[PDB]
Design the sequence.
């Protein structure tokens, strides 16, 4: 096929792009809802870089598969996080994944297709957030494991919910429904499961009518402050998280 | 009359100030709702500077005329925005208008008297925002023209609505009613059209009972962060906007 | 008793800590709701430093006594605030109280037991905010006295309510009920008076199950931006406030 | 010529066909005596300069043997009264904002002693000094008030945060040669050659396209503007409190 | 060896058993001619270097008598067209981000004239130069476009916000000795000894534990990264507008 | 005299009628051996100094022939255990915060080698050194851990972001004369004259009104405080990870 090589380079991402440069990127594990792994932690930064480098991507839709956006993780596959020499890989990849995802230089629409229980900081880099009615949001794994929620959730959830409710949400592992997230201005439209992707594409097609440089530079203008905020705290959060992972040996 | 010369220097601004130093500044075009022009883009920065320099202004009320705050623009009068040598004037004036409006050193009350479809970033520099029931807010012209919403809306709407709903609002050209804006904490009171100005003056009179230096330094204290945020992004937004205007020739 | 010496060092703070390292700190004046004084303005920074230094404090609950959190102040006891040589003490202590309260290195739960009419910026340093049904919030004293609300309220209320409603709230001395504050995401749970402290302890006990370093470093991660924002504006607010206090002599 | 060329009793203006504007501070043709009037009017003059797109390069200089070495202290008003200091405070924020907002390269031709208001020089892009020049923050610690008018930000930027604080706290005086070694002054010239050199540099710059002059100035002043904004109001409020304390 | 060692026609790679990687820029074995190709590929190369944990110290150098003194201007594409400049803009942000994100100490061995892209050198931790080296921002004011590609941030960081602006606005040339005195160059070596010294320094560093090399690099680049991020996109957008204006 | 004057086994305090406080670090009257105890107690001492409004100028110095050249490594506790390092981390943030929060001018009298904890000196306003003084970041790269305790921020501030990184990564040693040339040291004195000069400078300062001393210190440390706050916790967390890695 005439499509870019990177479209089929990632076992856990499906890519489809229309003639308008609207790219839908769908996370999956063997076609089912994603199980997050060491492999995805390593590869996703590269995938987001590849998407960002390709000037034929004019709008991006980021979504998951099945009835969850991301609700499963294969903890052992992440490597021995209690060993700082292994955590350093995770730390490096944690800084790159958000840098590279922010550096996508066109509007990014999240189509949140169900529970987002980990790695919801990805959603919080995107410009328009649509959620199916069954969606819930939670920072599940960190306080389950006893390690710092230091991978960007610590910056982006307090930006989303404000520095009061955002800290309550993280410290208590609060779960928000799609409707709550909508009232909290995180989700912008709540859709039936059967209509979520159609609506994402409809918004994308309207955006695609813009001149290319306008799509790109509006994205730049609207992400400057967000990038500064992420850069401020991402490395420190992930370093603190690494120390708490080490401490699990104590 | 004994009033300052600058009160009658601006064809598109009416000025009235009471014995308490409460200054009402009303935008108009021949007494009707304002039609924004190259002339206002050039003169408004000077008007806001003049207001800020005059220590007899103790509270400012900024409003429009008729049934719209600002809903019309004479696009050709702005000059050839696709020519960078002409856009540079617009760029320079775009940085000065927000700098000078923020540097008004007393509380500023917005009395939003109807549709605010362009230049709503002015409202988002002010301290107390009142709106008539017929008011709506939208960033109309930028994505209509295909150029970046880079004149301060890119900073101030995400500050107002948060960095999620704020980006949705700009990318989709969302229109908010006065009631929606009130629920979103942008508008602080929604008034009947017939009561808007009376309420602005009532709030102003309460404020005017404060010592002058308290009015001034409370304004300073409450605008430090806002000024930093505007300075961060205003020039870059307007430069990106200029490039997209040039690109319309392609 | 085996408890730390600092537990009984402060006439206006009662301390109680359980075997899980959950420390409840309760402000009082002779067992009644606190009357804020020059003495508390001077001592509270030391108390918060002492709490922060003690690694046996694993979660902190900060509360008041009786039916108000803080609703009274003995103005004369603050010293001659109109004399810059006296205000300088207040200025120095104003910077230290927020620095030291932020530097508590474990989650801090506010249990707001009634009206918080002054010094609510303390609450706005904490991570989880619970309020009894009778609670109200207001910046009462500053615009009553004619001096700048420059002690941290100018930073933290606009962070809590956004830079629009936050400035309206301060300039108009708005009073918010517990229910309003809950809708505004400042208060996270509204409790009957009889259940407030039980709920604070229940949340604390859940948190106390975390590893110690996770409690500490999650607090660090979630307060980096907050600390930067407070540092940006606290000294300038308090200096401006001092000038307005001097001006009361004019 | 523009009306503003003759609006300011303490500034002479001359502009050539290339858009090179020389702005010369003076008191009756002599070295400037700084006053309440200049404190109030200079922000307006710098704004007027910045608004005029026909200015393509700016040279800012003084008159006679000193760039600025004199001040009429009573003419600043009763600085010990916060209501009067507030004028000075507002004007002190505006002067640096408006000076930095000149949107073309600015050359300082420092024609002798700069003992006050040297922060103006530290907004400029190319700094030339005559061999007789000395730099000092004279007035603040002489009067017992904070050096809070931008010197507190820009001298530590120029000399680093170590020598910059020594310079301010001890009211150190720097010769032109020392300032050159410290990278503040870029060329040291004989008095009789200073202005010719300033104009030579300006002519070379003026050969650039106008947008390049403007946007190179913008690019090279972003960080500088942020740093001044961070500290200027706080420094001037603290200074005001120390001025009030002169009554005690 | 890694695949990326042979992916870049203008970069030679050699790595020893200690994880010391030497990256040498060249055009057919000679001193680099900078091109549209290098502008596009170098960001990828620096990313690839940064991803590879077997790199424990990096030495970045040029070939022949110059570090970088040549550029094929037409090969950069039609910079006066905003749609083409946008590629240069995106690549200009990525090159510095990816270079700064190399997570080990980086030694510059500057093997002669660095007349363009010297901002790469100003991301590195230890700067060595051969005695023949000169530094200049040559191309920008030659072409009439903003020096907006990071030189506008990093030269004023290196030389201070006074000499740094003089250096850019006048296209000043600095010898290796001047740059040494200005604390930009840390050791000046004969041409024939430069690379041996770079490798000696690298060997001493390589004795550190790997996490120490990595986290010392992180600690020492936090502020630097913030400063570059502040200004890089704005500088490159302004530069693009001046490139467009070359048509007028 | 205040109780805190005798609370610290490693600090001697002496204050004159002008409010000039000399704080001298020592171990049994000799040059300081830095310990876990000093790491824990110094933050409290600096807080106590800062709280006491009778301190109008502070001189911070060492004893004997060295300012700080010795450390009892085992006394710092088992730094390789994150639960123990956390104490060092918390204390490392507090020491610089509390030292910077001294609200009057601070004079460093550096009485010889400063081989560790030189970041304390880099919080002070006027830096004097005896001719025998040398500066180095000795311990971090000797132990294989990040120089993350503020040296990573303040040395690059002092020497610039180029020479500052060379100095840290190579554990460069600077003589008093070099440090003077680099604008870190402001006066170089014979050993026998150092303290007299410190007190002379302090006496001149002490003639200022108290609020002026305080608010000039505030004005001149705003930026410095921001820079330290930006990086101190991150540097100390990274350092802790490298300390843990010493087990591997
Ligand atoms: O995916 C990550 O961010 C790293 C994992 C490592 C294992 C425990 C977690 O939940 C986080
Ligand atoms: O008023 C402005 O900000 C400039 C105009 C220029 C023409 C197109 C627009 O809507 C914006
Ligand atoms: O408690 C304070 O912050 C200082 C007081 C001083 C007296 C007037 C006030 O309300 C504030
Ligand atoms: O010129 C100024 O900045 C104002 C004056 C204020 C009074 C004494 C001075 O030297 C400075
Ligand atoms: O190499 C670059 O950064 C791009 C070019 C753009 C055109 C002229 C130049 O010298 C710089
Ligand atoms: O004194 C310190 O900052 C702590 C120690 C930590 C262990 C080895 C060192 O040299 C630094
Ligand atoms: Ni912010
Ligand atoms: Ni800086």
Sequence:
């Amino acid at each position: 096929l005439n499509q870019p090589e990177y479209f089929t380079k990632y076992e856990n991402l499906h890519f489809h792009r229309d003639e308008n440069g609207i790219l839908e990127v769908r996370m999956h594990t063997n076609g089912s809802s994603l199980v997050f792994t060491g492999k995805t932690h390593r590869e996703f930064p590269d995938a987001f870089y590849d998407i960002s480098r390709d000037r034929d991507n004019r709008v991006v839709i980021l979504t998951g598969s099945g009835d969850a956006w991301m609700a499963e993780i294969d903890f052992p596959s992440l490597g021995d996080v209690t060993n700082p020499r292994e955590w350093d890989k995770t730390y490096w990849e944690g800084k790159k994944v958000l840098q590279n995802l922010l550096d996508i230089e066109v509007p990014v629409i999240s189509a949140v297709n169900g529970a987002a229980l980990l790695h919801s900081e990805y959603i919080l880099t995107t410009d328009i957030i649509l959620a199916s009615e069954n969606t819930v949001f939670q920072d599940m794994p960190h306080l389950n494991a006893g390690i710092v929620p230091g991978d960007g959730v610590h910056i982006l959830w307090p930006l989303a919910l404000g520095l009061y409710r955002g800290r309550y949400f993280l410290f208590t592992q609060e779960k928000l429904t799609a409707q709550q997230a909508y009232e909290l201005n995180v989700v912008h439209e709540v859709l039936p499961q059967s209509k979520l992707m159609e609506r994402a594409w409809e918004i994308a097609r309207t955006l695609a009518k813009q001149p290319t440089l306008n799509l790109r530079y509006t994205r730049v203008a609207l992400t400057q402050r967000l990038k500064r905020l992420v850069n401020e705290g991402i490395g420190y959060g992930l370093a603190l998280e690494g120390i708490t992972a080490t401490d699990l040996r104590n």
